[PDB]
């Protein structure tokens, strides 16, 4: 699927994209603070960021859809 989803519960510290930006596989999408790590969540495929759903400082649960590429 196109959904980039939060692999861990954590706190959104930074968003590395904007809505409608092109992204390539392995581009950074978000930084989640989980397990005391600034865990990078990255785009799995080339496309365009749509439905950007997360905000700086937001806590999000595992399986939250972050964006659709």
């Amino acid at each position: 699927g196109d959904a980039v989803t939060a692999p861990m519960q954590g706190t959104v510290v930074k968003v590395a994209v904007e809505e409608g930006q092109e992204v390539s596989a392995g581009d950074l999408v978000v930084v989640l603070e989980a397990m005391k790590m600034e865990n990078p969540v990255t785009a799995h495929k080339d496309g365009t960021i749509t439905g950007l759903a997360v905000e700086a400082g937001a806590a999000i649960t595992q399986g939250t859809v972050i964006a659709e590429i």
Partner: peptide
């Protein structure tokens, strides 16, 4: 691999 699940 630290980039995945902090390497747990």
């Amino acid at each position: 691999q630290p980039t995945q699940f902090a390497g747990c």
